Amino acid sequence: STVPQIKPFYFSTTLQEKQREQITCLAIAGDPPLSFSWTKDGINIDKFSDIIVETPKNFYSVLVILSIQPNHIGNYTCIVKNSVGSDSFTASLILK
Amino acid sequence: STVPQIKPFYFSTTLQEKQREQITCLAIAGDPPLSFSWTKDGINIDKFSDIIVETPKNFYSVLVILSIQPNHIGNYTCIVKNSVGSDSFTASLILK
Numbered sequence: 001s002t003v004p005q006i007k008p009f010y011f012s013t014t015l016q017e018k019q020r021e022q023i024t025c026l027a028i029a030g031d032p033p034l035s036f037s038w039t040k041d042g043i044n045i046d047k048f049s050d051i052i053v054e055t056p057k058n059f060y061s062v063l064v065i066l067s068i069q070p071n072h073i074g075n076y077t078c079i080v081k082n083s084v085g086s087d088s089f090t091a092s093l094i095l096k
Numbered sequence: 097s098t099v100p101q102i103k104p105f106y107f108s109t110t111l112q113e114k115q116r117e118q119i120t121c122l123a124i125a126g127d128p129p130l131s132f133s134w135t136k137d138g139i140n141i142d143k144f145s146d147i148i149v150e151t152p153k154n155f156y157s158v159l160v161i162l163s164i165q166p167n168h169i170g171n172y173t174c175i176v177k178n179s180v181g182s183d184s185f186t187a188s189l190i191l192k
């Protein structure tokens with residue numbers, strides 16, 4: 001009865017290489033079952049083997065990078081879907 | 097030789113009752129092993145039956161609220177520790 005709704009997530013503004021990073025695509029509202037999916041620059045997050053993606057609970061999914069390095073720059077987009085609707089959010093990983 | 101450093105976390109600005117919430121205390125920098133602790137309004141998070149606290153990986157801790165109620169208002173503090181230093185961050189939960 002409730003359309004999914006994603007809490008905004010961000011990468012660190014002071015990101016430096018070899019640091020660790022985590023973002024959570026949290027569905028603050030939305031009736032389960034919910035389907036989470038990730039893309040980086042329009043590419044399936046599959047193709048980036050340095051990135052770990054999990055769905056530990058049925059209402060959020062987590063993206064983790066153990067050692068940030070130049071190839072991780074891009075726009076990371078998460079999409080959540082259910083019976084009644086969808087939602088999406090994008091965050092940009094930048095390296096100064 | 098690297099002291100812990102927490103990546104900032106925030107609760108939703110548009111929080112409403114019975115919604116779900118998650119915050120991650122990520123040690124963006126710091127040598128393992130890392131020890132995570134939580135307090136709400138200075139009280140051990142142990143005492144709050146309706147709050148789930150886990151350490152899914154050894155470099156970030158997760159605080160999860162399945163259904164938000166008025167009791168959950170307060171300032172939540174994470175404290176990370178290792179051999180050579182510690183860090184702290186506080187995010188406050190508001191119900192408009």
Ligand SMILES: *[C@@H]1O[C@H](CO)[C@@H](O)[C@H](O)[C@H]1NC(C)=O
Pocket residue numbers: 073074075090092
């Ligand atoms: C996508 O990412 C590129 C580089 O990562 C950035 O310059 C651009 O502003 C982003 N586009 C959108 C629509 O967010």
Ligand SMILES: *[C@@H]1O[C@H](CO)[C@@H](O)[C@H](O)[C@H]1NC(C)=O
Pocket residue numbers: 170171188
């Ligand atoms: C913590 O929240 C209390 C109200 O519960 C308030 O008095 C105090 O100013 C807050 N602390 C900070 C640092 O905002």
